[PDB]
Amino acid sequence: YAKKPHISALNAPQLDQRYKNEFTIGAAVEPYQLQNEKDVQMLKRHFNSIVAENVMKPISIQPEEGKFNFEQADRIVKFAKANGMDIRFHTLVWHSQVPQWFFLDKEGKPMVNETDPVKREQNKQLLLKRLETHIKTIVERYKDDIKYWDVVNEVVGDDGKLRNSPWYQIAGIDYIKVAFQAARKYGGDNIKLYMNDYNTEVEPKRTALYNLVKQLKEEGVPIDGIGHQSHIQIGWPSEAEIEKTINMFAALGLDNQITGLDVSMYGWPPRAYPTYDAIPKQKFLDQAARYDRLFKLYEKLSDKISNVTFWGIADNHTWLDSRADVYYDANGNVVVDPNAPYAKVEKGKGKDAPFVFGPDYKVKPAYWAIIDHK
Ligand SMILES: O[C@@H]1[C@@H](O)[C@H](O[C@@H]2CO[C@H](F)[C@H](O)[C@H]2O)OC[C@H]1O
Ligand SMILES: O[C@@H]1[C@@H](O)[C@H](O[C@@H]2CO[C@H](F)[C@H](O)[C@H]2O)OC[C@H]1O
Ligand SMILES: [Cl-]
Ligand SMILES: [Cl-]
Ligand SMILES: [Zn+2]
Ligand SMILES: [Zn+2]
Ligand SMILES: [Zn+2]
Ligand SMILES: [Zn+2]
Ligand SMILES: [Zn+2]
Ligand SMILES: [Zn+2]
């Protein structure tokens, strides 16, 4: 409701306690935020699950072969343990924020360039060996502290084919199989292994993901759940399509986690307002009604969803701002209409507002829409 006041989130009813029998409530964080008093208070008050926005990605953990940097990841793990939070590991394998040394052959040349079939096969086995050592080292360190693992991220293309990353060009589908088998072998039966992706609701990617995981499980590849990034909009994807997607994977015996939820104010490609102040009130009411519907649906499906994680804490910090392109007409006025004329765009200079907490750490209408029982 819009009657409900814009109070400090540190005085508001706890979000994780509202949902504690339905699913955990998580947030993606940076270590610097554990030094910010407000962010610490926000995490202590409202969240019971945590994930690293960046410092557990492949390039952050092993930027050079043999050089492991766990310092930053350790800080997130320590904070979680001290506050009784679940931890998700994001992420063991990804085609982005991944060090290039992985994909160089013995002479330092890119493996993708290799044409000889015998050398190509040698490169596959070398890559798969490096992959296993990366996973082994990380999981040997964290298997007792981190329950949920994004083993692979974004391995299915939006075209419904496997994404043709260097991982896939060099090693084929086996890099996916090796990643899960290695995590299971070094982590044991008690860690939960996930395949994570965006637009899991969208054909042809959805059923390609479905076929992939169904085939892998049939071959004995250990995979326990699907991570739905859920980088969504006020109107897309539809709740019915979210519901159908989540039932589809639950029918395979898979857990579902909402791993990166944000509800952007904009379309795609976004035409953003240049500042938070410029976003009209009505956008916040539209977002709150979207959030109201969305969490009612998560509650409906709470037996198939173990965790809902936001990709951030409060509106003062969201990766969505890097997509918030501001369009200007010939008179220098801002253009937010997705079809209107415009002369220039300022990429990533605008402001999105995706969470239930505003940038001054006060509750948004979206918060009241999901803290109630209506
Ligand atoms: O790099 C990925 C990025 O491409 C993805 O953005 C989606 C692209 O497809 C549609 F346009 C959606 O609206 C976008 O959200 O977000 C995840 C990121 O890893
Ligand atoms: O800070 C940014 C970070 O938030 C972003 O994280 C990705 C967001 O899209 C999906 F959720 C991916 O799985 C996340 O890893 O990555 C880019 C970084 O600059
Ligand atoms: Cl209950
Ligand atoms: Cl960011
Ligand atoms: Zn309940
Ligand atoms: Zn709590
Ligand atoms: Zn301002
Ligand atoms: Zn549940
Ligand atoms: Zn960030
Ligand atoms: Zn509600």
Short mmCIF file of C-alpha atoms and ligand atoms in Angstrom, two decimals:
data_model
loop_
_atom_site.label_atom_id
_atom_site.label_comp_id
_atom_site.label_asym_id
_atom_site.label_seq_id
_atom_site.Cartn_x
_atom_site.Cartn_y
_atom_site.Cartn_z
CA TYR A 1 0.00 0.00 0.00
CA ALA A 2 1.00 3.63 -0.61
CA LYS A 3 -0.55 4.74 2.71
CA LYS A 4 2.23 2.96 4.56
CA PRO A 5 5.07 5.26 5.62
CA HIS A 6 8.60 5.69 4.26
CA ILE A 7 10.26 4.60 7.50
CA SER A 8 13.84 3.48 8.00
CA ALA A 9 14.32 -0.14 7.00
CA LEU A 10 16.30 -0.62 10.24
CA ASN A 11 13.03 -0.04 12.12
CA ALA A 12 10.84 -2.06 9.78
CA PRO A 13 9.59 -5.63 10.31
CA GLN A 14 12.23 -8.15 9.28
CA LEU A 15 11.92 -9.42 5.71
CA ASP A 16 13.56 -12.82 6.32
CA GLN A 17 11.32 -13.49 9.33
CA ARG A 18 8.23 -12.83 7.23
CA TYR A 19 9.28 -15.57 4.79
CA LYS A 20 11.21 -17.90 7.10
CA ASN A 21 8.89 -20.89 6.61
CA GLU A 22 8.66 -20.31 2.83
CA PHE A 23 12.28 -19.63 1.72
CA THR A 24 15.40 -17.81 2.84
CA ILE A 25 15.81 -14.13 1.85
CA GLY A 26 19.26 -13.36 0.44
CA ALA A 27 21.32 -10.44 -0.84
CA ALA A 28 24.36 -10.10 -3.11
CA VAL A 29 27.18 -8.16 -1.44
CA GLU A 30 30.69 -6.69 -1.87
CA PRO A 31 33.19 -6.84 1.02
CA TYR A 32 33.30 -3.04 1.31
CA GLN A 33 29.60 -3.21 2.27
CA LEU A 34 30.56 -5.22 5.37
CA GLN A 35 32.40 -2.09 6.51
CA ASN A 36 29.35 0.15 5.94
CA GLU A 37 27.29 0.45 9.12
CA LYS A 38 23.94 0.73 7.30
CA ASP A 39 24.59 -2.25 4.99
CA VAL A 40 25.72 -4.34 7.98
CA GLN A 41 22.56 -3.38 9.86
CA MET A 42 20.44 -4.12 6.77
CA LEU A 43 22.02 -7.58 6.39
CA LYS A 44 21.67 -8.39 10.10
CA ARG A 45 18.06 -7.19 10.21
CA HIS A 46 16.51 -8.44 6.96
CA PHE A 47 18.48 -11.25 5.33
CA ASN A 48 19.38 -14.81 6.30
CA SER A 49 21.26 -15.79 3.12
CA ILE A 50 24.18 -14.16 1.33
CA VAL A 51 26.06 -14.37 -1.99
CA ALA A 52 29.12 -12.54 -3.32
CA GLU A 53 28.28 -10.11 -6.10
CA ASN A 54 31.80 -10.47 -7.54
CA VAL A 55 34.65 -11.72 -5.33
CA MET A 56 33.95 -15.45 -5.73
CA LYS A 57 33.92 -15.33 -9.56
CA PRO A 58 36.66 -17.28 -11.40
CA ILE A 59 38.80 -14.26 -12.23
CA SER A 60 38.58 -12.98 -8.63
CA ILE A 61 39.60 -16.32 -7.09
CA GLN A 62 42.33 -17.51 -9.53
CA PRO A 63 43.39 -14.55 -11.72
CA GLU A 64 46.67 -16.29 -12.56
CA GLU A 65 47.14 -20.05 -12.55
CA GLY A 66 48.26 -21.01 -9.06
CA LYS A 67 47.46 -17.58 -7.54
CA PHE A 68 44.36 -18.03 -5.39
CA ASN A 69 42.90 -14.92 -3.73
CA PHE A 70 40.43 -16.08 -1.07
CA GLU A 71 40.91 -13.00 1.17
CA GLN A 72 37.79 -11.22 -0.09
CA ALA A 73 35.62 -14.33 -0.25
CA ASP A 74 36.74 -15.21 3.29
CA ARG A 75 35.33 -11.91 4.56
CA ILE A 76 31.87 -12.73 3.22
CA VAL A 77 32.00 -16.29 4.61
CA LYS A 78 33.10 -15.05 8.05
CA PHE A 79 30.32 -12.45 8.20
CA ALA A 80 27.69 -15.01 7.20
CA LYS A 81 28.83 -17.53 9.81
CA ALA A 82 28.91 -14.86 12.51
CA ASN A 83 25.29 -13.98 11.63
CA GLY A 84 23.78 -17.40 10.91
CA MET A 85 23.37 -16.80 7.16
CA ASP A 86 23.24 -19.34 4.38
CA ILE A 87 25.96 -18.82 1.76
CA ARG A 88 25.65 -19.35 -1.98
CA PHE A 89 28.87 -19.63 -3.99
CA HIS A 90 28.73 -17.51 -7.17
CA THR A 91 30.20 -19.03 -9.28
CA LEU A 92 32.54 -21.88 -10.24
CA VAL A 93 32.28 -21.59 -14.05
CA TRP A 94 31.29 -18.67 -16.29
CA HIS A 95 32.18 -17.28 -19.71
CA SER A 96 32.48 -13.79 -18.16
CA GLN A 97 34.82 -12.53 -15.44
CA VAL A 98 36.95 -15.60 -16.13
CA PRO A 99 40.76 -15.43 -16.49
CA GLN A 100 42.06 -15.85 -20.04
CA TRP A 101 44.92 -18.14 -18.95
CA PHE A 102 42.38 -20.99 -18.77
CA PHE A 103 42.11 -21.11 -22.55
CA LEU A 104 45.75 -20.81 -23.67
CA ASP A 105 47.63 -23.89 -24.87
CA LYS A 106 51.16 -24.91 -23.88
CA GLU A 107 52.72 -22.38 -26.27
CA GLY A 108 50.47 -19.58 -24.98
CA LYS A 109 48.23 -19.56 -28.03
CA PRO A 110 44.41 -19.46 -27.81
CA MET A 111 43.05 -22.99 -27.76
CA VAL A 112 40.08 -21.95 -29.92
CA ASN A 113 42.47 -21.25 -32.83
CA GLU A 114 43.82 -24.82 -32.89
CA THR A 115 42.91 -26.82 -36.02
CA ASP A 116 44.78 -30.11 -35.48
CA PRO A 117 42.33 -32.67 -34.03
CA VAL A 118 44.95 -34.39 -31.85
CA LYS A 119 46.06 -31.04 -30.39
CA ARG A 120 42.41 -30.03 -29.98
CA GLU A 121 41.82 -33.11 -27.86
CA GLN A 122 44.93 -32.37 -25.80
CA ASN A 123 43.62 -28.86 -25.21
CA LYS A 124 40.28 -30.23 -24.06
CA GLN A 125 41.92 -32.44 -21.46
CA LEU A 126 44.22 -29.66 -20.28
CA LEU A 127 41.27 -27.28 -19.93
CA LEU A 128 39.25 -29.89 -18.06
CA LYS A 129 42.23 -30.52 -15.78
CA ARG A 130 42.57 -26.80 -15.00
CA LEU A 131 38.81 -26.67 -14.42
CA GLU A 132 38.98 -29.51 -11.90
CA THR A 133 41.91 -27.97 -10.00
CA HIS A 134 40.05 -24.65 -9.77
CA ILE A 135 36.92 -26.32 -8.40
CA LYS A 136 38.92 -28.67 -6.16
CA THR A 137 40.84 -25.86 -4.46
CA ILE A 138 37.73 -23.75 -3.85
CA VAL A 139 35.49 -26.56 -2.68
CA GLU A 140 38.15 -28.12 -0.46
CA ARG A 141 38.33 -24.77 1.36
CA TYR A 142 34.60 -23.95 1.63
CA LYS A 143 32.67 -27.26 1.61
CA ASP A 144 31.90 -27.07 5.35
CA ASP A 145 30.67 -23.45 5.24
CA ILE A 146 28.88 -22.96 1.90
CA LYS A 147 25.75 -25.01 1.28
CA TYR A 148 24.58 -23.80 -2.16
CA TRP A 149 26.79 -23.63 -5.25
CA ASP A 150 26.32 -21.97 -8.64
CA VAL A 151 28.45 -24.66 -10.30
CA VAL A 152 27.91 -23.22 -13.78
CA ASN A 153 26.49 -19.86 -14.88
CA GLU A 154 24.79 -18.95 -18.18
CA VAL A 155 25.83 -22.04 -20.15
CA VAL A 156 22.71 -22.07 -22.38
CA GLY A 157 22.44 -19.55 -25.20
CA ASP A 158 19.44 -17.30 -25.67
CA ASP A 159 19.06 -19.04 -29.08
CA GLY A 160 18.30 -22.33 -27.33
CA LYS A 161 21.71 -23.78 -28.19
CA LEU A 162 24.52 -24.28 -25.72
CA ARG A 163 26.42 -21.03 -25.36
CA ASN A 164 29.46 -21.20 -27.65
CA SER A 165 31.92 -19.88 -25.09
CA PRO A 166 35.59 -20.90 -25.11
CA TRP A 167 34.53 -23.50 -22.50
CA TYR A 168 32.22 -25.09 -25.07
CA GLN A 169 34.38 -24.55 -28.16
CA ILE A 170 37.37 -26.19 -26.49
CA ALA A 171 35.76 -28.91 -24.38
CA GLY A 172 32.18 -29.45 -25.55
CA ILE A 173 29.42 -30.37 -23.11
CA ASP A 174 31.96 -32.19 -20.91
CA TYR A 175 33.02 -28.95 -19.19
CA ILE A 176 29.54 -28.83 -17.67
CA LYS A 177 29.69 -32.49 -16.63
CA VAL A 178 33.20 -32.12 -15.20
CA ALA A 179 32.23 -29.02 -13.23
CA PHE A 180 29.42 -30.80 -11.39
CA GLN A 181 31.26 -34.10 -10.92
CA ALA A 182 34.26 -32.25 -9.48
CA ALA A 183 32.13 -30.20 -7.07
CA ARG A 184 30.38 -33.34 -5.83
CA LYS A 185 33.60 -35.31 -5.45
CA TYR A 186 35.46 -32.69 -3.41
CA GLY A 187 32.47 -31.21 -1.57
CA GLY A 188 30.57 -34.34 -0.60
CA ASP A 189 26.87 -35.18 -0.71
CA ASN A 190 25.79 -32.35 1.59
CA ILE A 191 26.48 -29.35 -0.69
CA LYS A 192 23.76 -28.47 -3.21
CA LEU A 193 24.77 -27.98 -6.85
CA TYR A 194 22.94 -25.54 -9.15
CA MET A 195 22.86 -24.50 -12.79
CA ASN A 196 22.27 -20.72 -12.86
CA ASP A 197 20.98 -18.58 -15.73
CA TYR A 198 18.94 -15.55 -16.75
CA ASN A 199 15.74 -15.68 -18.82
CA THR A 200 15.09 -19.22 -17.60
CA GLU A 201 11.42 -18.42 -18.35
CA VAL A 202 11.98 -17.60 -22.04
CA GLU A 203 11.68 -19.91 -25.07
CA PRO A 204 13.66 -21.37 -26.70
CA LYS A 205 16.18 -21.06 -23.80
CA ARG A 206 13.81 -22.50 -21.17
CA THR A 207 13.23 -25.90 -22.78
CA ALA A 208 16.87 -26.10 -23.91
CA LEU A 209 17.84 -25.63 -20.27
CA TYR A 210 15.23 -28.25 -19.31
CA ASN A 211 16.49 -30.76 -21.88
CA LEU A 212 20.09 -30.10 -20.82
CA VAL A 213 19.53 -30.75 -17.12
CA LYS A 214 17.27 -33.73 -17.85
CA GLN A 215 19.94 -35.31 -20.04
CA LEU A 216 22.72 -34.64 -17.49
CA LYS A 217 20.75 -36.14 -14.59
CA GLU A 218 20.01 -39.22 -16.71
CA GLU A 219 23.75 -39.70 -17.17
CA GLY A 220 24.31 -39.46 -13.39
CA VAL A 221 25.74 -35.92 -13.39
CA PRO A 222 25.01 -34.53 -9.89
CA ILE A 223 22.77 -31.47 -10.14
CA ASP A 224 20.32 -30.52 -7.40
CA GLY A 225 18.69 -27.32 -8.56
CA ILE A 226 18.19 -24.47 -11.00
CA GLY A 227 19.10 -20.87 -10.21
CA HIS A 228 16.76 -18.31 -11.74
CA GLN A 229 18.64 -15.02 -11.87
CA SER A 230 15.25 -13.29 -12.37
CA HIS A 231 16.52 -10.03 -13.81
CA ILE A 232 12.98 -8.97 -14.61
CA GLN A 233 10.83 -5.95 -15.42
CA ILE A 234 7.60 -4.58 -14.05
CA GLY A 235 5.62 -6.36 -16.77
CA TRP A 236 7.87 -9.09 -18.19
CA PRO A 237 8.04 -12.00 -17.80
CA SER A 238 4.45 -12.74 -16.84
CA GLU A 239 3.74 -14.42 -13.51
CA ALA A 240 2.08 -17.28 -15.39
CA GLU A 241 5.30 -17.89 -17.32
CA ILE A 242 7.35 -17.69 -14.11
CA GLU A 243 5.00 -20.20 -12.50
CA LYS A 244 5.17 -22.60 -15.46
CA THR A 245 8.97 -22.38 -15.53
CA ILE A 246 9.30 -23.20 -11.83
CA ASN A 247 6.87 -26.14 -12.01
CA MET A 248 8.71 -27.49 -15.06
CA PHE A 249 12.01 -27.83 -13.24
CA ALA A 250 10.42 -28.98 -9.97
CA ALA A 251 8.90 -31.88 -11.94
CA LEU A 252 12.45 -33.05 -12.69
CA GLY A 253 13.06 -33.24 -8.95
CA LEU A 254 15.09 -30.01 -9.00
CA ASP A 255 15.12 -27.33 -6.33
CA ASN A 256 14.58 -23.75 -7.57
CA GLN A 257 16.36 -20.69 -6.18
CA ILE A 258 15.70 -17.09 -7.15
CA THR A 259 19.32 -16.00 -7.22
CA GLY A 260 19.58 -12.43 -8.52
CA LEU A 261 16.15 -10.84 -8.29
CA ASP A 262 15.80 -7.23 -9.30
CA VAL A 263 12.68 -5.56 -10.68
CA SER A 264 13.93 -2.92 -13.07
CA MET A 265 11.96 0.26 -13.68
CA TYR A 266 12.71 0.07 -17.39
CA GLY A 267 12.27 -2.04 -20.49
CA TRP A 268 14.89 -3.54 -22.73
CA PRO A 269 16.98 -1.85 -23.89
CA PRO A 270 16.41 0.47 -20.92
CA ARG A 271 15.76 4.17 -21.37
CA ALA A 272 16.57 5.33 -17.87
CA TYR A 273 15.93 8.45 -15.88
CA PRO A 274 19.26 10.19 -15.16
CA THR A 275 18.70 10.31 -11.37
CA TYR A 276 16.67 8.58 -8.69
CA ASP A 277 14.83 11.85 -7.97
CA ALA A 278 13.56 11.97 -11.58
CA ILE A 279 11.72 8.62 -11.36
CA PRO A 280 7.97 9.37 -11.02
CA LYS A 281 6.15 8.11 -7.93
CA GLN A 282 3.80 6.09 -10.18
CA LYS A 283 6.73 3.86 -11.21
CA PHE A 284 7.12 2.86 -7.56
CA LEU A 285 3.43 1.99 -7.29
CA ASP A 286 3.67 -0.08 -10.48
CA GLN A 287 6.74 -1.85 -9.09
CA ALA A 288 5.05 -2.51 -5.74
CA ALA A 289 2.08 -4.16 -7.48
CA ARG A 290 4.51 -6.28 -9.52
CA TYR A 291 6.36 -7.25 -6.31
CA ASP A 292 3.06 -8.00 -4.57
CA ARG A 293 2.07 -10.40 -7.35
CA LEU A 294 5.54 -11.91 -7.64
CA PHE A 295 5.99 -12.86 -3.98
CA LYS A 296 2.44 -14.15 -3.72
CA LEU A 297 3.47 -16.51 -6.53
CA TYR A 298 6.73 -17.44 -4.77
CA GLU A 299 4.70 -18.18 -1.64
CA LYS A 300 2.29 -20.30 -3.69
CA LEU A 301 5.31 -22.26 -4.98
CA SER A 302 7.19 -22.21 -1.65
CA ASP A 303 7.51 -25.99 -1.63
CA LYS A 304 9.57 -25.76 -4.84
CA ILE A 305 11.67 -22.68 -3.89
CA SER A 306 14.27 -22.78 -1.09
CA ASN A 307 15.69 -19.25 -1.46
CA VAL A 308 14.93 -15.83 -2.93
CA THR A 309 18.03 -13.65 -3.24
CA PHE A 310 18.07 -10.03 -4.38
CA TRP A 311 21.05 -8.92 -6.45
CA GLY A 312 21.84 -6.16 -3.98
CA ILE A 313 20.79 -4.61 -0.68
CA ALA A 314 19.20 -1.18 -1.28
CA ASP A 315 18.64 1.09 -4.28
CA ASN A 316 21.87 3.09 -3.74
CA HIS A 317 23.78 0.18 -5.29
CA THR A 318 22.67 -2.06 -8.14
CA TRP A 319 24.48 -3.39 -11.21
CA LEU A 320 21.34 -2.30 -13.09
CA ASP A 321 22.72 1.25 -13.13
CA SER A 322 25.36 0.05 -15.63
CA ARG A 323 22.53 -0.75 -18.08
CA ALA A 324 20.65 2.50 -17.27
CA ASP A 325 21.27 4.31 -20.56
CA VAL A 326 19.92 7.86 -20.68
CA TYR A 327 18.55 9.06 -24.02
CA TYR A 328 18.51 12.76 -24.94
CA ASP A 329 16.51 14.48 -27.67
CA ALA A 330 17.85 17.34 -29.78
CA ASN A 331 16.93 19.90 -27.08
CA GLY A 332 18.79 17.97 -24.37
CA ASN A 333 15.62 16.65 -22.73
CA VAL A 334 15.48 13.09 -21.41
CA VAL A 335 13.60 10.54 -23.51
CA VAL A 336 12.18 7.54 -21.65
CA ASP A 337 9.52 6.58 -24.25
CA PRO A 338 11.02 3.48 -25.94
CA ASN A 339 9.87 4.61 -29.40
CA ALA A 340 10.33 8.39 -29.26
CA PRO A 341 12.92 10.39 -31.22
CA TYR A 342 16.31 10.99 -29.66
CA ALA A 343 19.69 12.35 -30.70
CA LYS A 344 22.20 10.83 -28.26
CA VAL A 345 22.48 8.27 -25.47
CA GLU A 346 24.65 8.30 -22.34
CA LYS A 347 25.35 4.65 -21.62
CA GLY A 348 25.18 3.52 -18.03
CA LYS A 349 24.75 7.06 -16.63
CA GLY A 350 21.18 6.70 -15.32
CA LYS A 351 19.56 5.27 -12.22
CA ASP A 352 17.40 2.20 -11.71
CA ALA A 353 15.43 1.45 -8.53
CA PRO A 354 15.01 -2.32 -8.33
CA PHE A 355 14.68 -3.31 -4.68
CA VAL A 356 12.18 -2.94 -1.83
CA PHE A 357 14.59 -0.61 -0.01
CA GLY A 358 15.38 2.91 -1.28
CA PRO A 359 18.81 4.53 -1.53
CA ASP A 360 18.39 6.26 1.84
CA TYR A 361 17.65 2.82 3.38
CA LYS A 362 13.95 3.60 3.87
CA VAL A 363 11.22 1.16 2.87
CA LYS A 364 9.58 1.50 -0.55
CA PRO A 365 5.96 0.74 -1.44
CA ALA A 366 7.33 -2.56 -2.81
CA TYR A 367 8.43 -3.44 0.73
CA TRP A 368 4.94 -2.96 2.16
CA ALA A 369 3.57 -4.96 -0.76
CA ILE A 370 5.61 -8.02 0.26
CA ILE A 371 5.74 -7.69 4.05
CA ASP A 372 1.95 -8.03 4.40
CA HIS A 373 -0.24 -11.12 4.04
CA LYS A 374 -2.54 -9.82 1.33
O1 LIG B 1 25.41 -10.67 -19.19
C1 LIG B 1 24.07 -11.06 -18.87
C2 LIG B 1 23.09 -10.12 -19.55
O2 LIG B 1 23.17 -10.31 -20.97
C3 LIG B 1 21.67 -10.40 -19.06
O3 LIG B 1 20.82 -9.40 -19.58
C4 LIG B 1 19.64 -9.93 -20.18
C5 LIG B 1 19.82 -10.03 -21.69
O4 LIG B 1 18.63 -10.60 -22.23
C6 LIG B 1 17.45 -9.82 -22.05
F1 LIG B 1 17.61 -8.68 -22.77
C7 LIG B 1 17.21 -9.46 -20.58
O5 LIG B 1 16.23 -8.41 -20.50
C8 LIG B 1 18.48 -8.98 -19.90
O6 LIG B 1 18.28 -8.92 -18.48
O7 LIG B 1 21.62 -10.31 -17.63
C9 LIG B 1 22.46 -11.25 -16.97
C10 LIG B 1 23.90 -10.98 -17.36
O8 LIG B 1 24.77 -11.94 -16.79
O1 LIG B 2 29.00 -5.68 -10.32
C1 LIG B 2 28.54 -6.42 -11.46
C2 LIG B 2 27.82 -7.64 -10.94
O2 LIG B 2 26.74 -7.20 -10.10
C3 LIG B 2 27.34 -8.47 -12.12
O3 LIG B 2 26.78 -9.65 -11.59
C4 LIG B 2 26.09 -10.41 -12.58
C5 LIG B 2 24.67 -9.90 -12.73
O4 LIG B 2 24.01 -10.68 -13.74
C6 LIG B 2 23.91 -12.06 -13.39
F1 LIG B 2 23.18 -12.15 -12.22
C7 LIG B 2 25.29 -12.66 -13.18
O5 LIG B 2 25.19 -14.01 -12.73
C8 LIG B 2 26.00 -11.86 -12.11
O6 LIG B 2 27.30 -12.40 -11.88
O7 LIG B 2 28.44 -8.86 -12.94
C9 LIG B 2 29.11 -7.73 -13.51
C10 LIG B 2 29.67 -6.86 -12.39
O8 LIG B 2 30.26 -5.71 -12.99
CL CL B 3 3.84 -19.63 7.97
CL CL B 4 27.41 -3.36 -9.35
ZN ZN B 5 3.98 -20.50 5.91
ZN ZN B 6 17.22 -12.78 10.55
ZN ZN B 7 19.54 12.96 -6.50
ZN ZN B 8 10.49 -23.36 0.47
ZN ZN B 9 27.80 -4.02 -7.34
ZN ZN B 10 1.31 -8.67 -0.55
#
